[PDB]
Amino acid sequence: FDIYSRLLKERIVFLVGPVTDESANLVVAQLLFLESENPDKDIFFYINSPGGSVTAGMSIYDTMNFIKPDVSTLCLGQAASMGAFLLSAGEKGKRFALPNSRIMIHQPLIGQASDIEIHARELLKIKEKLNRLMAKHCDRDLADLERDTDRDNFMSAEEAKEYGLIDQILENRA
Amino acid sequence: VPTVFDIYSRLLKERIVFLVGPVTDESANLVVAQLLFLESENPDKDIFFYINSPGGSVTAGMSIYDTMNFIKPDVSTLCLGQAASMGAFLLSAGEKGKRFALPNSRIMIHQPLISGQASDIEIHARELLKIKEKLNRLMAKHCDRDLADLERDTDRDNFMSAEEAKEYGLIDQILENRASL
Amino acid sequence: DIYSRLLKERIVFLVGPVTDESANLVVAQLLFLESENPDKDIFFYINSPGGSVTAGMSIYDTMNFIKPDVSTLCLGQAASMGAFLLSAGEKGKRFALPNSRIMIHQPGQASDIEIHARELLKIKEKLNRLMAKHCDRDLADLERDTDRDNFMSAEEAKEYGLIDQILENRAS
Amino acid sequence: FDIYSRLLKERIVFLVGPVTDESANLVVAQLLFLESENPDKDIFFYINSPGGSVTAGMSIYDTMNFIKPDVSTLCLGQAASMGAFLLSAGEKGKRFALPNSRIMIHQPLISGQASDIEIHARELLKIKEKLNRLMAKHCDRDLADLERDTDRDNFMSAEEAKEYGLIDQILENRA
Amino acid sequence: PTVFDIYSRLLKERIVFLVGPVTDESANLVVAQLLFLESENPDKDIFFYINSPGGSVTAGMSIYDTMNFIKPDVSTLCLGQAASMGAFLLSAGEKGKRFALPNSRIMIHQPLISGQASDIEIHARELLKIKEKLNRLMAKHCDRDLADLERDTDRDNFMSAEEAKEYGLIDQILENR
Amino acid sequence: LVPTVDIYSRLLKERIVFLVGPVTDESANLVVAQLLFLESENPDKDIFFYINSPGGSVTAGMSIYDTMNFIKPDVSTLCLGQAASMGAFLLSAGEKGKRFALPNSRIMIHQPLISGQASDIEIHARELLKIKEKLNRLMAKHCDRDLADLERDTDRDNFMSAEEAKEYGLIDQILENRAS
Amino acid sequence: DIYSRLLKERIVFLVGPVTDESANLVVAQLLFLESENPDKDIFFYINSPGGSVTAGMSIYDTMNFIKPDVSTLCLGQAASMGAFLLSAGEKGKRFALPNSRIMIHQPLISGQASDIEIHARELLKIKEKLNRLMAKHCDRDLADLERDTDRDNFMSAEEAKEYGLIDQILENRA
Amino acid sequence: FDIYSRLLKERIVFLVGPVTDESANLVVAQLLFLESENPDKDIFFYINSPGGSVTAGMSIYDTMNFIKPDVSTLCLGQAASMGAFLLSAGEKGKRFALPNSRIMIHQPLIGQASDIEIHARELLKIKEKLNRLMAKHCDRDLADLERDTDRDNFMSAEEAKEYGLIDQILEN
Amino acid sequence: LVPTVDIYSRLLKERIVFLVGPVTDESANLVVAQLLFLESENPDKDIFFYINSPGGSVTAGMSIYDTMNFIKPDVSTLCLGQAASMGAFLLSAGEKGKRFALPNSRIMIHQPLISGQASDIEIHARELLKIKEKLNRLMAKHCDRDLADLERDTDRDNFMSAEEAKEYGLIDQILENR
Amino acid sequence: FDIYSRLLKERIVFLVGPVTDESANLVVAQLLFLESENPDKDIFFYINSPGGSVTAGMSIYDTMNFIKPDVSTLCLGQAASMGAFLLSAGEKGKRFALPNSRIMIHQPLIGQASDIEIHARELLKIKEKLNRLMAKHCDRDLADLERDTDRDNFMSAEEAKEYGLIDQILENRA
Ligand SMILES: *[B]([O])([O])[C]([C][C]([C])[C])[N]C(=O)[C]([C][C]([C])[C])[N]C(=O)C1=[C][C]=C(O[C])[C]=C1Cl
Ligand SMILES: *[B]([O])([O])[C]([C][C]([C])[C])[N]C(=O)[C]([C][C]([C])[C])[N]C(=O)C1=[C][C]=C(O[C])[C]=C1Cl
Ligand SMILES: *[B]([O])([O])[C]([C][C]([C])[C])[N]C(=O)[C]([C][C]([C])[C])[N]C(=O)C1=[C][C]=C(O[C])[C]=C1Cl
Ligand SMILES: *[B]([O])([O])[C]([C][C]([C])[C])[N]C(=O)[C]([C][C]([C])[C])[N]C(=O)C1=[C][C]=C(O[C])[C]=C1Cl
Ligand SMILES: *[B]([O])([O])[C]([C][C]([C])[C])[N]C(=O)[C]([C][C]([C])[C])[N]C(=O)C1=[C][C]=C(O[C])[C]=C1Cl
Ligand SMILES: *[B]([O])([O])[C]([C][C]([C])[C])[N]C(=O)[C]([C][C]([C])[C])[N]C(=O)C1=[C][C]=C(O[C])[C]=C1Cl
Ligand SMILES: *[B]([O])([O])[C]([C][C]([C])[C])[N]C(=O)[C]([C][C]([C])[C])[N]C(=O)C1=[C][C]=C(O[C])[C]=C1Cl
Ligand SMILES: *[B]([O])([O])[C]([C][C]([C])[C])[N]C(=O)[C]([C][C]([C])[C])[N]C(=O)C1=[C][C]=C(O[C])[C]=C1Cl
Ligand SMILES: *[B]([O])([O])[C]([C][C]([C])[C])[N]C(=O)[C]([C][C]([C])[C])[N]C(=O)C1=[C][C]=C(O[C])[C]=C1Cl
Ligand SMILES: COc1ccc(C(=O)N[C@@H](CC(C)C)C(=O)N[C@@H](CC(C)C)B(O)O)c(Cl)c1
């Protein structure tokens, strides 16, 4: 059993690199597994991601919120964009980041003019929805979210804790 | 893929079928194969089909569609991430009462897209018109509403949250966790 | 050359993609015909499938700015911006050849894309409104008739008010 | 065991996508193993093919009518061009199409010195004349009708193909 | 070669060339010539020499209408080939003054093309309108009934100068002056 | 491809100088040349600088800008089609009272743009910031405005109609024809 | 320019391949010389490997249509369609420099089967027509041309003169 | 049990080639596994790397310092930039290079003016952070790390010993 | 592409030489030609060299430099836009008393940039280094600045404003209007 | 077992083709595991390589001496640049070549002025380092080695032997 096959036996799941349909649904399949083999031990999601497909990241997000085991998120390397979004979305009290991590949040990115308007209102709805869910994960005013995702918002783990995006900083096991 | 059996296969043993990414004859027939396999394994229990797709080829999706229904097993559908175009068509094509979407998933519907002689172009454009009309009709049957709504609403990209699609008739229930049942 | 000669007969050509360079070339010709004589008609010949909006607007505002009455003639095709500039000719002096085709249709961070989509809709309405003026028609009719590609014969573009008359031979 | 090997344990064979030399010879090999395993139970050839190489598909054709077990075809998604041809040649009374399938029959598409061109064109017209023949045999249709109805892309639904004689019956559910 | 270049010298004979695919460039160049020669003298014939595979339909119609608009009769001469739009503009010449050289070939075929279903429909229906209009016009030129053009153009129809002259597509096959 | 009578040469002694498409060292310097030419022929007649540009290099644009302020003629600007970014920086740079625009032109203004070692990227960013502030202040002088208005209004793409660019102070008038 | 000077002396070149444009440039020079003096011969210098059959028949039928006799001279080479145009100069007036190279072969190229049929039939019409015309140029039987164009047939100026292609090989001015 | 698996068995982990998001996570997973096998027996980390991404390197860094086992580091061939960061991050007393392995330290090196200003602030912060951590691994001032890493600073194994970069160089 | 009245010849009639863009062989030689022709046409009048350049090759620039010093006429430099790298070196090489810049022109100076066997590489690096130190030589001369000042101020990009360029010694005055 | 694992059982490690970091480190790994397997058995390093990354070559080199077993090197086909260096690195007394092999030795080959100064100085330091280690492998005067590495110096197996690079040439098993 390959290194990840074993580390999946201590209920450790990883997210490395961008969040694509395939990387996301792989995370999702691993989560579903670890629940079906025990829906009451907590699952540990280690995130090192720059972000990626919002739809792909939402597959994960909704799966975490769906499954019975608590999903403890830990950011190593970087949790930027949807990576930061899935890090903040851990079970409250159970969100973590290594000391030298870095968390980055920002508003989203990227036919007939009719279709331009369609997709534009839709992308602004995505901006809205994400700002609200992030204010939730952080217990902050929606206004705080909108104002703090306008451009690139980089965070030491200290800042993301204070900002409420994570629960604690972990130098080591103690 | 990590081995545990590998992960998609271990979930296969929970009757979990995945469709990830766009619809190609390739992945469409892979999914068709898994569904026929789960019926040859258990022609009675429910097959659980997970959708995270932007759409794709129409006949590729029709092959899956026809694998559904035909098989005695009920194919429950659950969208995660996204299920647009033919993805939404299939999501609405699940066994009635067994079509679902997670809370923050996104469902989009739109008219059929395209990637010689005037005779050939006439022929194939009218073919596309019959296809667009057949799709509108089947979708009106999946959403249990009239047709006119489907033609008006699929003229341009029509996006919907998990709740607008349920009120449309694409799915039947939203699920936050298993308790939501 | 041939085009400088026809120019000396006050005939300006628009051919193909309305771009910055081609539109402003037409603009230089317009100002030079007004220079040489600000009181004789100009004859603007259009076979264009459209192009840049601001390019075409440089032209539009010039045609309306200069003292000469600018007549227009569509040959082959006038599409999008081409159809717009064909509509923009001096009223009573807009023409097309008996087998021309006139065709009208609509045109970073999420903050930026909001800015630009709002801009694009502003442009869409601006064009619908000017176009309705030209044809003397309802903005609500322009909206409906430019929603997808709208192809029109010379007879149809005439009844629609895009053009005044069809020129078969030089018997008006 | 992978998914397709397990499904071969059901005597189920697929042609997915274009008919190439390989993608057709693989099908021929599967039709062979099913005859070795058990030369009397029918094989069920499942067809979702846009058509393509006529030699590659002729291997499958001659193979279908060569082996002893009856071969029952099924159009899912699409049987276009040589797809529609092989679907048409399944063991008679055993040619089926799913209800929302689509079938298309056409004269052959395709894309040196004048003597070369003169050789190759007269090979292609002979092909074009062979294919309408074997189709008129498969559909119990006239040959003239196949000639006409293949001039350009003739599109037919499962019922239209059943009415042409291309398939025998449509299948909705297990029934 | 400078003789002015060669083509301007022959323009001083009212000789206008259409060589190669009918683009927008080339169609408007021919149109500008036609107008220049009517400006120079609106009563001497213009001589339009066509060797083209065809091209853009609307480009070619910019020429087709300029011919019937300018005062000069426009005599057409096929040398080499006049195919598709070439043959059409060739048969568009002033009747009695349409000519071909004896090894010119002439070919007529139906129109060709290389988004949303609603748009694909509009453009396919438009192309059908094109096909039918062009068929009626070719029937007028060749003095044929429309069904005959519909029938004789469904695929590629090649034609010798004898075949062409009979098809009413031209008036004479000129060996020499 | 420019017809002889070439046509822009002819116009050049209507003292009309064109700027079209991007502002580059080459095209900006060509305008720079035309300006000195018109001044030499007559350093007491107005020049009519017509602009249909989406902008470009800022040093290229400053060529035209600082030349505009150095010659003796009044450099009356006009916009047709679009003057965006530095193209809009120059339209507002015309002699006050002589900056105009046609009815359906489009102005747009926004902050700077851009397509090594930390120490080097440090320096390049510092200069880009000096230039954002420089552009903002000079812009603020052109529309007779507060520098803060310009920082606010140029943070992203600010599109303006001719009325809006007028009110903003970029242009002085809107011209529909000769009676205007 | 040198070539306009030479045009003054009624020499029309044909260098490189024979496209629609190069062939039309030659046709236009033919007409300009004829109009300028219809009763003086025109000298047509061919160094060409051949090319577009239709662009070639433009030059062919045009040489035949203008009053002036068109003498043809082969320097370098006249291949496939170049050779055919060489053999088409006014009978008695077709020449080649001593170290010329002539080549003649049947036509070649480098859709639907019904369309393909139509196209092949037309290609064969062209082949037969060209063999008939070439045979008339050469005063040979048609079967002679059929057999001898079946593949690439190479001829020295010598051999081109026997076959019926040219009339005189030209060593020096003597 | 392929060569690298067999060598993993007794707590040998290789970082070979650049520090990417994936090549780093593999070493991180190996460190976690070797701890899950025994948090009390040391882990030998073999480094032949030109460097790589900074995020991916701090992931391994904090994984090194978090887990219970001492992480000893061993440079073979080269440990440049980030490779030399993690080589210094080895448990003090337990950092080694081969005799002819070569070390290099350098300062880091890689929209609108706003976004540029932001990312520039972030990179200057990253540079500062790394210089401080490096000041402490070596016993050296922050001034020493600012000055000495201004450009590519090459080190023999011995000079690196001097610098507090490693502890000992190993012959046989 | 370039209007006749072409305009560049016509400003040459006024002793205006342009350097626009990167210093290449062909552009630097196109400048050398104009300096020689204007010295021949009248060696008793100033030539006006207008620089808007990011810089470029150092030998190509040295040709212009040595030509500025060879001929008799005072070559008066004017920065417009930017005179970066070599362009700045040229601008500073103008006759002392006749070097100017338009007020929003930006100036830049830095050390030489560049973009086989070990022997060959040592060899070429030696030639990059005497080049760096010779450029510092000449620039400290033009600025009436000591050499160390230049060696220090060119280790990385040093952007300067018109006023800053004046204070350095790179130009003499700034021009707003005549 | 693949064939290379089978021969690795016999304690044979190949260096074939270029010396990249990946390839050199795979050879390092095989050396280490053969030591683990048995540190009282010698290792057979089969070199048919043109050279590669000097640093990767050094990674293998510093291994050879450090592990306990004698690392014998055998040049078959060729050993050039870094391959030849590692060949000369075999346990002194155990550096072999095949008869039709050959050896090649030469000098190392391949921003701002300061950085190029730095990298230059470094490259010349690598040069000196390598020359001195060479003189040590072959016991020759350092003068020889640098003067005998100014450009490409080719050697038969015999020439390598008299040079000190290798020790024995081998015809057959006898
Ligand atoms: B992150 O950099 O992954 C960021 C997610 C934020 C909102 C937490 N990503 C996006 O916003 C992405 C950009 C790339 C990283 C993929 N944007 C989209 O995925 C995307 C793409 C296409 C469309 O069309 C509507 C929408 C979106 Cl939202
Ligand atoms: B959707 O993006 O999945 C859409 C199908 C919906 C309406 C259920 N996709 C298509 O319609 C595709 C477009 C590409 C994105 C693949 N269209 C076709 O596959 C197609 C192509 C050609 C013809 O007739 C010639 C019909 C069709 Cl349906
Ligand atoms: B169909 O698209 O499967 C069609 C075959 C039908 C009529 C049963 N395909 C072809 O006819 C192919 C065309 C390409 C799409 C591959 N044609 C040939 O393979 C071909 C090529 C060459 C010749 O003679 C030289 C004959 C043929 Cl049949
Ligand atoms: B011929 O191949 O030039 C043919 C002319 C006659 C005989 C019909 N040309 C065309 O049919 C052209 C196609 C060429 C580009 C190959 N048709 C058009 O250009 C065309 C097609 C479709 C539409 O409507 C979208 C417009 C036009 Cl202009
Ligand atoms: B506009 O997009 O034309 C804008 C001008 C505004 C800000 C007045 N142009 C730019 O911002 C350009 C964009 C690039 C295409 C070059 N930027 C510059 O011109 C520029 C930016 C920064 C620096 O040095 C840091 C030099 C230059 Cl020339
Ligand atoms: B010669 O090699 O140029 C040869 C001329 C004769 C003597 C054989 N050239 C051709 O035959 C050319 C082929 C290429 C050299 C261009 N043939 C054609 O141009 C051609 C081929 C086929 C058709 O029918 C569609 C028309 C034409 Cl014009
Ligand atoms: B070394 O070349 O590996 C070096 C590490 C030290 C000694 C400074 N690497 C970096 O500095 C890397 C640059 C490249 C390797 C890509 N820096 C980054 O990766 C980096 C830089 C800046 C930002 O903020 C935008 C993020 C990152 Cl991840
Ligand atoms: B500047 O970027 O123009 C700079 C000149 C000054 C400020 C130092 N030019 C260069 O550094 C160029 C690099 C290219 C961008 C042209 N360097 C040279 O031209 C050069 C460099 C080194 C040597 O000797 C090895 C000769 C030359 Cl000509
Ligand atoms: B041989 O061609 O393998 C040769 C080895 C000896 C005999 C000199 N290889 C090298 O010299 C290599 C060059 C190429 C193979 C890439 N030198 C280096 O790899 C090298 C050179 C310089 C520096 O410092 C910047 C590092 C490296 Cl790794
Ligand atoms: C960002 O703001 C914008 C948005 C759009 C444009 C623009 O050019 N639109 C153009 C699109 C393309 C030709 C490029 C456009 O719509 N052209 C059409 C004109 C009319 C009838 C709507 B017809 O295709 O020429 C422009 Cl500058 C600026």
Swiss-Prot record, chain C:
Its EC number is 3.4.21.92. GO terms for biological process: protein quality control for misfolded or incompletely synthesized proteins. The keyword Protease applies. Belongs to the peptidase S14 family. Cleaves peptides in various proteins in a process that requires ATP hydrolysis. Has a chymotrypsin-like activity. Plays a major role in the degradation of misfolded proteins. It catalyses: Hydrolysis of proteins to small peptides in the presence of ATP and magnesium. alpha-casein is the usual test substrate. In the absence of ATP, only oligopeptides shorter than five residues are hydrolyzed (such as succinyl-Leu-Tyr-|-NHMec, and Leu-Tyr-Leu-|-Tyr-Trp, in which cleavage of the -Tyr-|-Leu- and -Tyr-|-Trp bonds also occurs). Signal peptide: none annotated. The active site is at S80, H105. Gene3D superfamilies: 2-enoyl-CoA Hydratase, Chain A, domain 1. It is found in: Cytoplasm. This is ATP-dependent Clp protease proteolytic subunit. It is an enzyme of class 3 (hydrolase). GO terms for cellular component: cytoplasm; endopeptidase Clp complex. Disulfide bonds: none annotated. Fourteen ClpP subunits assemble into 2 heptameric rings which stack back to back to give a disk-like structure with a central cavity, resembling the structure of eukaryotic proteasomes. The gene is clpP. One of its GO terms (molecular function) is ATPase binding. InterPro entries: ClpP, ClpP/crotonase-like_dom_sf, ClpP/TepA, ClpP_His_AS, ClpP_Ser_AS. The keyword Zinc does not apply.
Curated annotation (Swiss-Prot), chain D:
Disulfide bonds: none annotated. One of its GO terms (biological process) is protein quality control for misfolded or incompletely synthesized proteins. The active site is at S81, H106. Its EC number is 3.4.21.92. SUPFAM superfamilies: ClpP/crotonase (SSF52096). It holds the Pfam family CLP_protease. Keywords: Cytoplasm, Hydrolase, Protease, Serine protease. It catalyses: Hydrolysis of proteins to small peptides in the presence of ATP and magnesium. alpha-casein is the usual test substrate. In the absence of ATP, only oligopeptides shorter than five residues are hydrolyzed (such as succinyl-Leu-Tyr-|-NHMec, and Leu-Tyr-Leu-|-Tyr-Trp, in which cleavage of the -Tyr-|-Leu- and -Tyr-|-Trp bonds also occurs). Belongs to the peptidase S14 family. This is ATP-dependent Clp protease proteolytic subunit. It comes from Neisseria meningitidis serogroup B (strain ATCC BAA-335 / MC58).
